[PDB]
């Protein structure tokens, strides 16, 4: 069936941004609502956010607003989050979280990415 | 500095009656038909909401021949026809006709609401019809009507433009031609280049142009030839509220509401659109099949013809019933099935035209010379709109100066 | 936002054994809760969405039930392929959150 | 005591036209369109329920270059333009717009109802929409119009005040600038004060001041100045009859009902509001596109522009037509989807104005100094309003002698 593939891992600087990708490779997709969630070592899993394109929805949380962005291509079908002011506690792997139009309801995340390891050190 | 016809256009005593016999147009409502293997057109499309654009052509004065001649001197006179009367003979019953679509763009009925909706599909297109304004109109000139319409812009080079971005938006000035469609209650814009699905207005506007005639522009023209007469009567409101279906292009702003939980966790839909309804068709609010007598223009011209060309533009909704025809199949069966008949819809329109003219003459000076070479160069050799479709109309082969034996002679004849 | 905890935060068990792990809200969110199942080395896997409701290729000895501020999760029948990292959600409003997790380990 | 400019001011026998060419206005009819990161606004606000305040700017005749001068003394002459003749051109067709808000508080449909709502929800909030009432004004002076709303007030310090007590209410005029919102048929108040929900009213008024003119205040003013000329005309009735939802904040006196049981036990929002609509758009009962003519004015100031300064105030929801814009983002589909489109709103207007001025004349003789600096101290020294947004018009460099060239000075030199 669809698979979700991710771009490879990262290595940054402290002050820097980064940026992840996501693509659709199977079939059609026509993504319904994306989002992204990450976990550091030791520790459980952290919504970061979501977007759905329909009903023009773009939220953050509290944490987290005004250093993180989360854009969709339906052209291509290929997510991107972006991050900005990168700190030591940003190394952590990442996970891209998708729902497909059609469903029951905008959070049936059924398709999700490999992970992609982010490191920020100097 | 222009100044007016009077001055310069002698008028004699001589009148002239012009009519057409009757003119009738059969069709297809909402689209031509047309054979799967060829591109020619069976059935041409004929609507209510069509502008009708006639031209008409006139004799030349100069050589058409009269009974009398001595009243002008052919070595320094020339004539030229003047319109003084106007009458637009309208057939058929009153009637209103509707359209629709079948696959039309909509969300939700907003007008009253009890539950919200939480989630959304694939494809919630509709099957919805109505009716649209009412208008009726009459324009008379000597140059074809000019009309205005919203379309596409050339945008800015300094930033790349991404699919789905909103178009650029600019009025357009163009000629109105036979065939042209008129507002129906959705604005003046070009549907096919402002919308990409195909699906937000009914079958006969969906990949048209609707066009509203510029009156700002056309009484400010210095010479006043392209507007002798009109007059003008629209009205509408509106029946149903409904939402649309889609990605939202623009976010409603955060300082705006406070965000729901649970069903209004997301926003609803805020592109909303209206149903329009023209309301009522009487006899008494009509203004066809009443004569019109051109007294004084308000511009400069008072009615010449200038190169013996008239132009009539009309528009009237207020005769639009359209017909439905069924054909049997097989007749061999006594009880009803739905696949032995077929059904077809049809649209009959019926006209009449009947004028009044006057003969004038121009003694040509030097100082008229140059200011009718001025004016219009092309005038000066008889003594361009080959890329429009009108209506034409031949009246060079009916004349008569007998003017009592017609019905608006008789009037004409009444009113002086 | 919404403050979710998950109860335990580890325990112990046996194959053919019952495990059921509580989930708290710190407001009523009616059923929009789901169950999430995470394993190292891969991602996480949705197993039960809006409280009750069973994803499609899950076996039947998953179950959840709850509503208002209180929800559960019962394994039946446990299985050697079932000790995973466990997840509650909140998707009453469009800002997400997780539960702390809990660690479901061989006696 | 306040006399006549009949008395002090003379006017000569000469005549001049103004006019604009044309005025453009597209946007978004409900909110402005901002950059994320930025604050700078991309696309304005533009919706039909907009006051239009055109501030005009004139020549000084004393500066201006006349051809002849022998008709007045510069020694002890002073020379100023007075308004004879007002013409507001209006494109664009008629049409109805529409607005609501994706989350407006409305409970119940209390008009027909068959079961009683004995439970309460969290969030009970609906979309709606709604066409709001018809009115059109002009309003033409030599100082900027004055209007008027409901506000809070300074409460007593009597006692203290707990929070989700009823504001206070006060009387309040300003003056309306360009972009103010005329009122709609929920009244003349400031919703971003009064109402703390955000979901009361649609998403174009919600955070805005809706302002009524201010007529009685106007007309009794003892110069005359503000208002040389004004027309009204506006209507309405109710469509729909809903409930609220929220808590009680007055409660209903236990004299007044019988208590119930059962379904009944509780009571039911009294909190009942309507929902406008303005009925039907015609031609017939338009007042724009019509020549004014300025004989006499109702207060003592009969038209005299003081320091070469016009204010002109326009409502006109009769042309309120919205369109709808659609955008493909892939075009690589043969079967439709909803995300694959995107969908815009977007709202033009179009404006014309064209003016007759006449020449006057003062002799500034002691007394008439006197009675002129005690009414303006300014015209004196020329021989304030920086804090407010006004669609400037400039019509320094557009006079002309030449009546009879213009539509407007056809007419004029026709009635007389």
Redesign the interface.
């Known amino acids: 069936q669809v698979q979700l593939v991710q771009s490879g891992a990262e290595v940054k600087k402290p002050g820097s941004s980064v940026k992840v990708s996501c693509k659709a490779s199977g079939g059609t997709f026509n993504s319904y609502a994306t989002?992204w969630?990450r976990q550091a070592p030791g520790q459980?899993?952290?919504?970061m956010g979501?977007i759905?394109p329909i009903f023009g929805?773009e939220?953050?949380?509290?944490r987290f607003q005004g250093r993180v962005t989360i854009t969709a291509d339906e052209s291509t079908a290929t997510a991107y989050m972006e991050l900005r002011s990168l700190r030591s506690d940003d190394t952590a792997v990442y996970?891209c979280?998708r729902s497909r139009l059609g469903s029951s309801?905008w959070?049936?995340?059924?398709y999700?990415?490999?992970?992609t390891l982010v490191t920020v050190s100097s | 500095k222009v100044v007016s016809t009077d001055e310069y256009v002698a008028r004699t005593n001589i009148y002239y009656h012009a009519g057409t016999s009757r003119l009738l147009a059969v069709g297809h409502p909402y689209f031509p038909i047309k054979k799967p293997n060829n591109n020619k057109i069976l059935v041409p499309k004929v609507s209510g909401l069509q502008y009708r654009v006639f031209r008409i052509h006139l004799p030349d004065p100069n050589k058409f021949g009269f009974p009398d001649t001595s009243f002008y001197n052919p070595d320094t006179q020339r004539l030229v026809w003047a319109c003084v009367g106007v009458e637009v003979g309208r057939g058929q019953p009153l009637g209103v006709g509707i359209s629709g679509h079948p696959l039309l763009n909509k969300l939700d009925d907003t007008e009253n609401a009890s539950a919200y909706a939480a989630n959304a599909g694939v494809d919630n297109r509709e099957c919805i019809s109505m009716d649209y304004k009412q208008t009726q109109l009459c324009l008379i000139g000597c140059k074809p009507p000019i009309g205005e319409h919203w379309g596409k812009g050339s945008p800015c080079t300094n930033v790349a433009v991404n699919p789905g971005d909103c178009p650029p938006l600019e009025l357009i000035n163009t000629v109105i031609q036979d065939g042209d469609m008129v507002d129906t209650g959705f604005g003046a814009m070009d549907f096919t280049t402002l919308q990409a699905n195909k699906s937000e207005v009914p079958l006969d506007i969906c990949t048209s142009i609707c066009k509203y005639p510029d009156y700002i522009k056309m009484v400010s023209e210095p010479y006043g030839d392209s507007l002798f007469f009109y007059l003008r009567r629209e009205q509408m409101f509106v029946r149903h509220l409904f939402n649309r279906a889609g990605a939202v292009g623009d976010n409603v702003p955060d300082d705006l509401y406070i965000?729901g939980?649970?069903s209004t966790?997301?926003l609803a839909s805020s592109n909303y659109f209206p149903t329009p309804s023209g309301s009522m068709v009487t006899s008494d609010a009509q203004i066809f099949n009443k004569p019109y007598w051109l007294q004084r223009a308000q511009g400069h011209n008072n009615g010449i013809c200038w190169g013996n060309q008239l132009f009539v533009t009309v528009v009237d909704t207020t005769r639009s019933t359209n017909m439905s025809l069924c054909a049997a199949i097989s007749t061999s069966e006594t009880t009803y099935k739905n696949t032995n008949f077929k059904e077809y819809l049809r649209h009959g329109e019926e006209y009449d035209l009947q004028f009044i003219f006057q003969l004038c003459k121009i003694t040509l000076t030097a100082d008229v010379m140059t200011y009718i070479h001025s004016m219009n160069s092309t005038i000066l050799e008889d003594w361009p709109l080959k890329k429009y479709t009108f209506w034409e109309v031949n009246l060079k082969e009916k004349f008569s100066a007998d003017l009592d034996q017609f019905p608006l002679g008789r009037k004409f004849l009444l009113q002086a | 936002?919404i403050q979710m905890t998950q109860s335990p935060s580890s325990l112990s068990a046996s194959v053919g054994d019952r495990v059921t792990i509580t989930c708290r809200a710190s407001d009523?969110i009616?059923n929009?809760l789901?169950w999430?199942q995470?394993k190292p080395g891969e991602?996480?896997?949705?197993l039960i969405?809006?409280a009750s409701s069973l994803?499609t290729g899950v076996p039947s000895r998953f179950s959840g039930s709850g509503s208002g501020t209180d929800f559960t999760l019962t394994i039946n029948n446990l299985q050697p392929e079932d000790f995973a990292t466990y997840?509650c959600?909140q998707?009453?409003?469009?800002?997400?959150?997780?539960?702390?997790?809990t660690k479901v380990e061989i006696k």
């Open positions: 989002g969630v459980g899993l952290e919504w979501v759905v929805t939220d953050y949380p509290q996970y979280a309801s959070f049936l995340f059924e999700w990415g490999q992970g | 965000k939980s649970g966790a997301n | 936002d009523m009616s929009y789901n999430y995470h991602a996480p896997k949705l969405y809006s994803q997840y959600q998707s009453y409003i469009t800002r997400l959150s997780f539960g702390g997790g």
